[PDB]
Every structure is written in structure tokens, then in C-alpha cells.
């Protein structure tokens, strides 16, 4: 399944929900690329909820 | 659990596991007395190989990218070797994500 | 491992260590560390004899807390082989846990009731024992002494009339020291444990040595109606992140896709216009922002191997 | 270069490598807790380097930390585990014995039985376990038609 983003959504999922971007700033340039990230987000159970 | 289990590398039986703690996530095997220890880096296979469900053989190979490296791991139980072979799957889909994503960038 | 799990697990080793001797322990505790377990390898872990390991085995097996499963085993460079495997049915060691408890305490219960009733009688030489309503049939005439039959002597009282503290004192014992088996029990009977079979048991095996020749495996033979007694027990995320340029490059591919929709439904020509004449069908701007760009950077300056195998 | 000795730079030595460096009852018991496997480590080679196990692996078998395995020409111990239970001598002969006189009903028979006295039975009788046109028109189209029987 493919789901499509944009820089105004991420700024957007950023603003609405500081979570988000707290385990953003802290892994993209440490662990793993960005996309590999919001692939895990998408998967998680945290964007379930 | 989905993350371990047995399995016979290179004729000798041992503890296969998934380690995704670790960026990138990698495959450790190791075998029972611990006098042989094999690690495959999860980046570097391309396809992932695995004996269909009607044949008695249980043996699952990671192709590696480039004379390819080839790293086979055979099971004693299907169910294992499913549970193991899906976490896979969505580490090597992921990583051929990550490298196409560079590429085309 | 299921919390559950590890109660049974408890259990079993604390019925092992108090009920059956040492060895019992290591055979069983073997197969509690590993899953089905090869005799070979069994063997070998525990470093025994087959002679003793024969009345390990047996005993474990007549009580139920270990199960034997054989299968024909074909290795590739040597001829065919019986190979026996042993595991553990937690249904079935249970049940003969849950028995074997109620059985002890209610032999010891009765043993209470039996030595709390009258004594008895016995006679010295022939060594038959005579209930109380027995010996007042044999009496002498001189209503004095129980005679017996077969030798016409008089009859000795019998034991156990001061054992009435003792057998409670041991039922006192008892069901304290056999305290966690209850305890475990309450708690199997509140969850549900799943039956196990050769094959499932196969999917938690620690495997025991490197190369090991038993191979730990269940190829059940093709279309075998046989059955022996007691055999049966009851997607892909990918994310695209679109930039400004790519945004336009998908307009354009919607634009496209829908100038291909119009063009599915518009008429054909021949229904378009009258076709009667026609002939019948047949066979420099970059100076410049230079110049700019040095000149506000002036100013800011002055303010400052070959098998079968798919694709997964 | 043999394995079986090992060097100190700092006065220059050759000293004895032991296969299980076990001088204390605390590091073999958690030598025993590490093993991956339920392969006993031997006293043979256990007492090789340490002056006196006996001594120290009979008391762990009174404390119930270890099991181990001894011989039968006299007591004296060999293989020896982690003992991951409990106590190891928890009830009394009066009640082993009664133990082994009981002897269990066919196992066919036995949840019945239990059953009846009133408790749960954690099984089932085996007995139970219910182990589950012609003449064609065109055929120009030989391999063409794919069956779309239902939708
Ligand atoms: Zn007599």
C-alpha cells in the first residue's frame, strides 16, 4: 500500500502533535534515513492511536 | 516469540535471531557451544529465497547484492521459519525502500 | 513463554524434586530446558548409561509427565533409523499430578478413619486377623478368651490403638509440604493450557549439541490414514514523499489521465458528420543579479547448491 | 603458542590455564546459570585447578543451589547443573513411597475420574478428538477461456 506525503503535511503532523517531532529530532541524522522513519510511524501502534 | 528460534547454518544447529534494535538491523546466528558465530548486515540482501510450503525441505536463503554472497538457513519447524521469515520481509522491503529512495534522489 | 507456561513449568520441577529421586530431576529438567529431546541426545547431555536412563524413562513415562513420540528417520548417507524423541504433555502430566495428590491425601484420610475404629484381633500362630464382630462368634463356653478357629488358641489383641494422634500428625504434614502443588493447580485450573504435540513442542527446541545426527524435524508421511492411539491433541508499507516538483509532475499525470477518460467516451467521426459525398468503404539577466548581489553586499559591508525456491 | 598456557608480560611467566577458572562457589554458580545448554560441566575437569570442590560442591547440594550427579562405587560427585527449582529435598519418604503405590487409571479413563470427585480435569478422552456433460461447440478458443464460474 502506498501513501503519499508532503513537506506541508510533515510540518503539519509536527505542529498538531509535539510527540511526533520529539522522536524525529532525536533519530532522522542518528539511526536511520527519514524515510525509513515514517514508514515505522505509519506501522507503529503510536499512530493508531 | 517472532525474533528467534533454531536453525541448522552450514550443517551445524544453532540459535538463529533478529536483532532490530541495532541500526542497521542484522541476522546472528549462533551455534550451541558458541564456537561458530555468523552476522549478516540486513542492507546488503537483495531477495530473500524460502522453500515453498509443499516440500518437507524448511530452508530459507538471503541472497546478498552485489559472485553474490549467499547465506542459507535451514529450520526444524515451518511455523518458525514463517514467524522469521515475515519479520524479514519487512526489513529487506524497507531497505529496498531506503535504496531506492537515494537512488532516485 | 506464557506466564501459564512457567507455572506448569514450576510444577512439574517441584513434583520431580520432592516425589521421584535425584536423577529423575536432571532427565526431566533436560527436557524442560530443551523441547523434544533425542534419547541419543538425552543421553549424551546427561552423560548416562542406557541401562540407567532405561528406568529413568520408564518411570517418567508410566506417570505420564513425559511423552515418547518414534518416527522413521532417513539420513542420506546411512541407513534408515527408528529415532525416539521425549517431551512433555502438560495436559496430561497435570491430570496425573492433580490424581496422584488427591489419591495420596485420601489414602492417608482413610488410614485416619480405618485406626480411629476399634482394634481388632490376631491369632499368634496362624496369623489371621479377626474384626471385632468375627471374635464374638469364637468365644470359649467359659465366656473368658477368643478362641480361634483354625487353632483352637486364644485370640491376641491387635495394634494401632495409639497411632490416632499419628496419622493426623502425618496429615498435618502432609498438606503443608504439599502446599505449591494446590497453590499451582488453583492457578492451571483459572487459564487454559493448550494440548502439545511432537510438532509444536518442535517450535520452542533449544537444540542440544552441534551436530546432532537426530534431525529434529516432523515430516508427517502423504495421505497416511493411519492413526496410532494417543497421536492427536485437540503486509508491505511503502511511503512516497512528494516534493514541489513532483507535485507538478503528478498534476500533469492526472491531467493526462483524465484527458484519456474524455477520450474514452467522445463519439467516433463517421457519427460526427454526415458522410454522403465521400467516397464508399472498401479494400544578460544573470549580469545583472550578479551586480546586485555584490552591490548589497557592499552595503551590508558599510552599515556595518541448487533446490526449489519462490520469491517472498 | 599452545593454548593451554597463558603469559604474563609484567614478570615475564608461564602460568597454568585452567578450562573453568573456578575458585569460589559464587563464580560456578553462575558459570552454571550462563550454560546455554543442559550439558553438565564435569567435576574431573572442575577440580583440576581448585584445591578442593568436594568440599565445596556437597555444600551447595545441602543449600540446593546445584544438582548433582554422583558415582555408585562410592558418593562422590560428577556433572553437575544449575538447579533452577526449588528446594531438592522438600518431602518425606513417608510420602514418596505412598507416591509410587498409586498407580494411575487408564488414561483413556482418567479425566472421567476426575470428573466425578469434583475436579477440573486439564484433558479429554482421545476418543473425542474428531480428526477432520459433453460435446463442446467451439474449441478455436483452446486455451483462451479462463473459468469465471461464481462472479
Ligand atoms: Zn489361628
Given at each position: 500500500v502506498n501513501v503519499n506525503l508532503s513537506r506541508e503535511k510533515?510540518?503539519?503532523?509536527?505542529?498538531?502533535?509535539?510527540?511526533?517531532?520529539?522522536?524525529?529530532?532525536?533519530?532522522?541524522?542518528?539511526?536511520?534515513?527519514?524515510?525509513?522513519?515514517?514508514?515505522?510511524?505509519?506501522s507503529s501502534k503510536l499512530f493508531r492511536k | 516469540m517472532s525474533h528467534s528460534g533454531a536453525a541448522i547454518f552450514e550443517k551445524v544447529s544453532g540459535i538463529i535471531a533478529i536483532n532490530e534494535d541495532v541500526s542497521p538491523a542484522e541476522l546472528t546466528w549462533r551455534?550451541?557451544?558458541?564456537?561458530?558465530?555468523?552476522?549478516?548486515?540486513?542492507?546488503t540482501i537483495d531477495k530473500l529465497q524460502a522453500t515453498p510450503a509443499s516440500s518437507e525441505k524448511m530452508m530459507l536463503r538471503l541472497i546478498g547484492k552485489v559472485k553474490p554472497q549467499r547465506h542459507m538457513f535451514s529450520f526444524n519447524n515451518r511455523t518458525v521459519m514463517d514467524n522469521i521469515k515475515m519479520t524479514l520481509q519487512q526489513i529487506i522491503?524497507?531497505?529496498k525502500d531506503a535504496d531506492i529512495y537515494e537512488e532516485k534522489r | 513463554d506464557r506466564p501459564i507456561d512457567d507455572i506448569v513449568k514450576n510444577l512439574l520441577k517441584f513434583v520431580v524434586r520432592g516425589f521421584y529421586g535425584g536423577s529423575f530431576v536432571l532427565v526431566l529438567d533436560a527436557i524442560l530446558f530443551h523441547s523434544v529431546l533425542?534419547?541419543?541426545?538425552?543421553?549424551?547431555?546427561?552423560?548416562?548409561?542406557?541401562?540407567?536412563?532405561?528406568?529413568?524413562?520408564?518411570?517418567?513415562?508410566?506417570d505420564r509427565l513425559i511423552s515418547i513420540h518414534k518416527q522413521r528417520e532417513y539420513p542420506p548417507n546411512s541407513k534408515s533409523v527408528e529415532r525416539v524423541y521425549y517431551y512433555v504433555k502438560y495436559p496430561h502430566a497435570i491430570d496425573a499430578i492433580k490424581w496422584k495428590v488427591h489419591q495420596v491425601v485420601q489414602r492417608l484420610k482413610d488410614d485416619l478413619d480405618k485406626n480411629s475404629?476399634?482394634?481388632?484381633?490376631?491369632?499368634?500362630?496362624?496369623?489371621?486377623?479377626?474384626?471385632?464382630?468375627?471374635?464374638?462368634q469364637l468365644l470359649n463356653f467359659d465366656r473368658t478368651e477368643f478362641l480361634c478357629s483354625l487353632c483352637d488358641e486364644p485370640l491376641v489383641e491387635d495394634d494401632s490403638g495409639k497411632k490416632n494422634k499419628e496419622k493426623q500428625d502425618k496429615l498435618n504434614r502432609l498438606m503443608d509440604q504439599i502446599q505449591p502443588i494446590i497453590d499451582?493447580?488453583?492457578?492451571?485450573?483459572?487459564?487454559?493450557?493448550?494440548?502439545?504435540?511432537?510438532?509444536?513442542?518442535?517450535?520452542?527446541?533449544?537444540?542440544?549439541?552441534?551436530?546432532?545426527?537426530?534431525?529434529?524435524?516432523?515430516?508427517?508421511?502423504?495421505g497416511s490414514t493411519m492413526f496410532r492411539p494417543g497421536d492427536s491433541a485437540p503486509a508491505t508499507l511503502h511511503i512516497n514523499i512528494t516534493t514541489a516538483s513532483d507535485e507538478?509532475?503528478?498534476?500533469?499525470?492526472?491531467?493526462?489521465?483524465?484527458?484519456?477518460?474524455?477520450?474514452?467516451?467522445?463519439?467516433?467521426?463517421?457519427?460526427?458528420?454526415?458522410?454522403?459525398?465521400?467516397?464508399?468503404?472498401?479494400?544578460?539577466?544573470?549580469?545583472?543579479?550578479?551586480?546586485?548581489?555584490?552591490?548589497?553586499?557592499?552595503?551590508?559591508?558599510?552599515?556595518?547448491?541448487?533446490?526449489?525456491?519462490?520469491?517472498? | 603458542k599452545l593454548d593451554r598456557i597463558e603469559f604474563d608480560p609484567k614478570k615475564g611467566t608461564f602460568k597454568y590455564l585452567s578450562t573453568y577458572d573456578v575458585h569460589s562457589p559464587s563464580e560456578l554458580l553462575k558459570l552454571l546459570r550462563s550454560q546455554v545448554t543442559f550439558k553438565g560441566i564435569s567435576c574431573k575437569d572442575l577440580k583440576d585447578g581448585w584445591p578442593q570442590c568436594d568440599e565445596t560442591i556437597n555444600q551447595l547440594e545441602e543449600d540446593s543451589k546445584i544438582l548433582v550427579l554422583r558415582t555408585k562405587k562410592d558418593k562422590t560427585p560428577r556433572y553437575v547443573w544449575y538447579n533452577?527449582?526449588?528446594?531438592?529435598?522438600?518431602?518425606?519418604?513417608?510420602?514418596?513411597?505412598?507416591?509410587?503405590?498409586?498407580?494411575?487409571?487408564?488414561?483413556?479413563?482418567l479425566p472421567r475420574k476426575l470428573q466425578d470427585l469434583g475436579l477440573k480435569p486439564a484433558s479429554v478422552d482421545p476418543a473425542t478428538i474428531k480428526r477432520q456433460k459433453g460435446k463442446i461447440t467451439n474449441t478455436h478458443m483452446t486455451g483462451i477461456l479462463k473459468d469465471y464460474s461464481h462472479r
Open positions: 510533515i510540518l503539519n503532523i509536527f505542529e498538531n502533535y509535539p510527540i511526533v517531532k520529539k522522536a524525529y529530532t532525536d533519530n532522522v541524522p542518528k539511526n536511520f534515513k527519514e524515510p525509513e522513519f515514517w514508514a515505522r510511524f505509519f | 551455534s550451541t557451544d558458541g564456537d561458530k558465530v555468523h552476522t549478516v548486515v540486513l542492507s522491503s524497507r531497505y | 533425542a534419547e541419543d541426545d538425552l543421553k549424551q547431555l546427561l552423560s548416562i548409561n542406557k541401562t540407567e536412563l532405561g528406568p529413568l524413562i520408564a518411570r517418567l513415562r508410566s475404629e476399634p482394634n481388632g484381633y490376631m491369632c499368634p500362630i496362624c496369623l489371621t486377623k479377626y474384626t471385632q464382630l468375627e471374635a464374638v499451582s493447580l488453583k492457578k492451571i485450573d483459572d487459564s487454559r493450557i493448550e494440548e502439545n504435540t511432537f510438532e509444536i513442542a518442535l517450535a520452542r527446541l533449544i537444540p542440544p549439541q552441534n551436530q546432532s545426527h537426530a534431525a529434529y524435524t516432523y515430516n508427517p508421511k502423504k507538478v509532475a503528478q498534476r500533469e499525470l492526472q491531467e493526462r489521465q483524465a484527458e484519456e477518460k474524455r477520450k474514452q467516451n467522445a463519439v467516433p467521426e463517421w457519427h460526427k458528420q454526415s458522410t454522403i459525398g465521400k467516397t464508399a468503404l472498401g479494400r544578460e539577466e544573470r549580469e545583472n543579479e550578479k551586480t546586485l548581489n555584490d552591490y548589497y553586499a557592499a552595503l551590508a559591508k558599510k552599515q556595518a547448491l541448487e533446490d526449489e525456491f519462490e520469491d517472498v | 533452577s527449582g526449588g528446594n531438592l529435598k522438600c518431602i518425606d519418604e513417608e510420602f514418596v513411597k505412598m507416591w509410587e503405590n498409586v498407580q494411575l487409571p487408564q488414561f483413556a479413563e
